[PDB]
Design a protein around this nucleic acid. Structure first.
Ligand SMILES: [Mg+2]
Ligand SMILES: [Mg+2]
Ligand SMILES: [Mg+2]
Ligand SMILES: [Mg+2]
Ligand SMILES: [Mg+2]
Ligand SMILES: [Mg+2]
Ligand SMILES: [Mg+2]
Ligand SMILES: [Mg+2]
Ligand SMILES: [Mg+2]
Ligand SMILES: [Mg+2]
Ligand SMILES: [Mg+2]
Ligand SMILES: [Mg+2]
Ligand SMILES: [Mg+2]
Ligand SMILES: [Mg+2]
Lengths: 226, 25, 50, 127, 97, 63
RNA sequence: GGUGAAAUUCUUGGAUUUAUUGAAGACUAACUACUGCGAAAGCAUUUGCCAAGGACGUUUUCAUUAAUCAAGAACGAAAGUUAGGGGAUCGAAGAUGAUCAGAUACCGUCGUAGUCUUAACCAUAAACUAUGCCGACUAGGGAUCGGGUGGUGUUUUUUUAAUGACCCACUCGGCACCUUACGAGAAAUCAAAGUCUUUGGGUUCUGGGGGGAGUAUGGUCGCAAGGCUGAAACUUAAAGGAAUUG
């Protein structure tokens, strides 16, 4: 497909990286690993103001690179660049995600999946949508081989999960919550309310996405990058 | 020929007859 | 159905317009009869795609 | 100690897209496709054609300076075949052996929640 | 004469089953009549590990696996080195190999 | 013009519709333990030494 | 991009590609199964409201109210019609590129009606289990859904109870299944397609060699498309069903 370009110009050389200068992404407070990585922006001219050209980027990282332990291998994290200064552009939490392989590996047939989500808002008015997933489990000594729910448990479990997610956000602004997903305390906490209903193995919560964010308030962001 | 098409061939034909008979009444 | 004294369309040995009925936006009063500055004509097919 | 990028490789039938990008994804480096290497239009997705494209993107990294790169294999996605093309993997082996550092290999092909409609009609592509 | 007791499918008491598209030729086909097979493979290769191991930081990273469910229409499945044809007596064996 | 020498450990079988090409999997002499499967045209044994103008493609192995 | 391979097509005005963000319409993936519901068409994201239904439990009530049904009525996939809304994607017609002896086709790129919804029509389908409905009896066995019963049984709470999830045994109803042929059948095959020459449990519908023909005509229903009811002349010794060997 090389010598087939019939026509180039409808109406009828400098290296782009000559004015490209690397920056550094600076993770928020509650992450043990700090150096996220580097970015590329072309040089800021008098009129271009490339310093403003990168406030909108969204950088992609994994907790395994943030906590350093493979136990968080999948645990996908989306960080949003918030303000740039002194080659050390500062980021903030944008949203959690699961890897594709992990999500497909959990879904085996001969069992019942339960999924749920809520649209709670935080103390600092951040609006978040938390998704929660679960799967049923075969009781030890089981003879029958499928272990489906009774479709009134799934109604009942979904009610309990939704209450828990609302509780765990409200009264928590943004970072304790960020430092709550890392230890997966919510994952363990939900299981406390379902064992009396149904086994419900494998409760890794889900992606959580951010919908609407409040005023910038330079000061609050400064707290994270102490 | 196929049964589907023979039934269709009749149907078009009954349109021609139902129209030419209308020239009279 | 009018005479050429009456309308841009008027007149003819048959009732016919004679020239395209799509008038420009820049025409003058007395020249703007018919469809004014039409982007398209004919029966509308498909969604408006506004 | 290593600068990253994202491989963002497009395994598909009829071509192969490989291009490292800055970790943000906005800034792009060395977008080379599989059709750029073979003037046959039939080997567009051939493993050898994909291999050549991967090397040049890997080769073009040193001049920029990026040394390591995350990998995101990605098929046609959507209501399409959803399975990576044969040039899909030969580029990946080409990227790793040419010197760059690989990390965080993942599949990112778009899967729908039972999307609109698949082309082909009711009886499909009769041949 | 009747060829099968289920005649094509596993529909007994269903009325209707809301078809799915064949993933090889897009031929529409009911879900229960399809030839569902699951395709799980190493994300890279059975041989690339000899190279993707050394060329990777984070030694022994995960070797993740891709997941996909493949529906096949009878016409494509028979043609595609799959279930193709068995003896009249062997048609009754439902045990997978 | 870089040239690599590869040695045959064993021959896997004959492929191609015609049946003239045989499937043989080899290893590079230098930088040993690096092995590859490639397709060869002429008569072959084990322990043969091949010359590859390129040493980077994974040949189609019939399986 | 597309393909067995190309061409039309979008491309230096920046395509395909990458990122952030927005809109719109449809669909309800993976879970998803010899699994569930419904009279049948049909029905798979969450919650709330509205009314319904079976099965089970029952030492509640009425007491033969029942079974099947001409006429008659309700619902009735898709396509199609009428009028607003909507109009993403796919796509009858149509326009194009290729193949070919030709290609008004299969392959490719576009694309109108249609697809969606509202209000009102249509009344058909391989509408299939090609197996009318109610009732009794005739062989075993595994498995599953719903309800129930018993088991110092396992599990989690509060080691501890009750529950919930499991395990064992049993039972009522359902979706099915596996072996056998006492029996049935032309046979393929059937736990009903058995209890039919040792021919009678009650009942509705349909059929009578192949073509002409589901045609003509006449009614009647429909906006129309068309539906339902429906011959005769004529012509013929075979059409057909299931298995066997080639
Ligand atoms: Mg047959
Ligand atoms: Mg049906
Ligand atoms: Mg562009
Ligand atoms: Mg179910
Ligand atoms: Mg769903
Ligand atoms: Mg009928
Ligand atoms: Mg019938
Ligand atoms: Mg009976
Ligand atoms: Mg059962
Ligand atoms: Mg029971
Ligand atoms: Mg049932
Ligand atoms: Mg008779
Ligand atoms: Mg007769
Ligand atoms: Mg026969």
């Amino acid at each position: 497909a090389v010598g087939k370009n019939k026509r180039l110009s409808k109406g009828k050389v400098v290296d782009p990286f000559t004015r490209k200068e690397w920056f550094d992404i600076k993770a928020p407070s509650t992450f043990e690993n700090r150096n996220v990585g580097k970015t590329l922006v072309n040089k800021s001219t008098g009129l271009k103001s490339a310093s403003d050209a990168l406030k909108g980027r969204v950088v992609e990282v994994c907790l395994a690179d943030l906590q350093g332990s493979e136990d968080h291998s999948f645990r996908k994290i989306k960080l949003r660049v918030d303000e740039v200064q002194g080659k050390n552009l500062l980021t903030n939490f944008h949203g959690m995600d699961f890897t594709t392989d992990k999500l497909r590996s959990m879904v085996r047939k001969w069992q019942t999946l339960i999924e749920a989500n809520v649209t709670v808002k935080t103390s600092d008015d951040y609006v978040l949508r938390i998704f929660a997933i679960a799967f049923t489990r075969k009781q030890a000594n089981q003879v029958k081989r499928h272990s489906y729910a009774q479709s009134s448990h799934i109604r009942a479990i979904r009610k309990v999960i939704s209450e828990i997610l609302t509780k765990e956000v409200q009264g928590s602004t943004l970072a304790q919550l960020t430092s709550k997903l890392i230890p997966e305390v919510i994952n363990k906490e939900i299981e406390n309310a379902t064992k009396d209903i149904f086994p419900l193995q494998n409760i890794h919560v889900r992606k959580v996405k951010l919908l609407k964010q409040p005023k910038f308030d330079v000061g609050a962001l400064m707290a994270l990058h102490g | 020929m196929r049964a589907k098409w023979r039934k269709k061939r009749t149907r078009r034909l009954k349109r021609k007859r139902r129209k030419v008979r209308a020239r009279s009444k | 159905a009018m005479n050429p004294v009456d309308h841009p369309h008027g007149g003819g040995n048959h009732q016919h317009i004679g020239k395209a009925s799509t008038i420009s936006r820049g025409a003058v009063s007395g020249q703007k009869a018919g469809l004014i500055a039409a982007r398209r004509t004919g029966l509308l097919r498909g969604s408006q795609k506004t | 100690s290593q600068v990253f990028g994202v491989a963002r490789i497009y395994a598909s039938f009829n071509d192969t897209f490989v291009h490292v990008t800055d970790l943000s994804g906005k800034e792009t480096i060395a977008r080379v496709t599989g059709g750029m290497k073979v003037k046959a239009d039939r080997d567009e997705s051939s493993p050898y054609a994909a291999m050549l494209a991967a090397q040049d993107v890997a080769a073009k990294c040193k001049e920029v300076g990026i040394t390591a790169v995350h990998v995101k294999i990605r098929a046609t996605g959507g209501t399409r075949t959803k399975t990576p093309g044969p040039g899909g993997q030969a580029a990946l082996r080409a990227l790793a052996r040419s010197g760059l550092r690989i990390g965080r290999i993942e599949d990112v092909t778009p899967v729908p929640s039972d999307s609109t409609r698949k082309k082909g009609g009711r009886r499909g592509r009769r041949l | 004469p009747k060829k099968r007791a289920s005649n094509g499918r596993n529909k007994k008491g269903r009325g209707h089953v809301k078809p799915v598209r064949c993933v090889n030729c897009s031929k529409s086909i009911p879900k229960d009549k399809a030839i569902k097979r699951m395709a799980i493979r190493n994300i890279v290769e059975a041989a690339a590990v000899r190279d993707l191991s050394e060329a990777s930081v984070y030694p022994e990273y995960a070797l993740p696996k891709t997941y996909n469910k493949l529906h096949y229409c009878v016409s494509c499945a028979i043609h595609a080195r799959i279930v193709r044809v068995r003896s009249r007596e062997d048609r009754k064996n439902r045990a997978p190999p | 013009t870089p040239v690599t020498l590869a040695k045959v450990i064993k021959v896997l079988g004959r492929t191609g519709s015609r049946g003239g090409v045989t499937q043989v999997r080899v290893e590079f002499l230098e930088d040993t333990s690096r092995t590859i499967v490639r397709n060869v045209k002429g008569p072959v044994r084990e322990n043969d030494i091949l010359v590859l103008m390129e040493s980077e493609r994974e040949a189609r192995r019939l399986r």
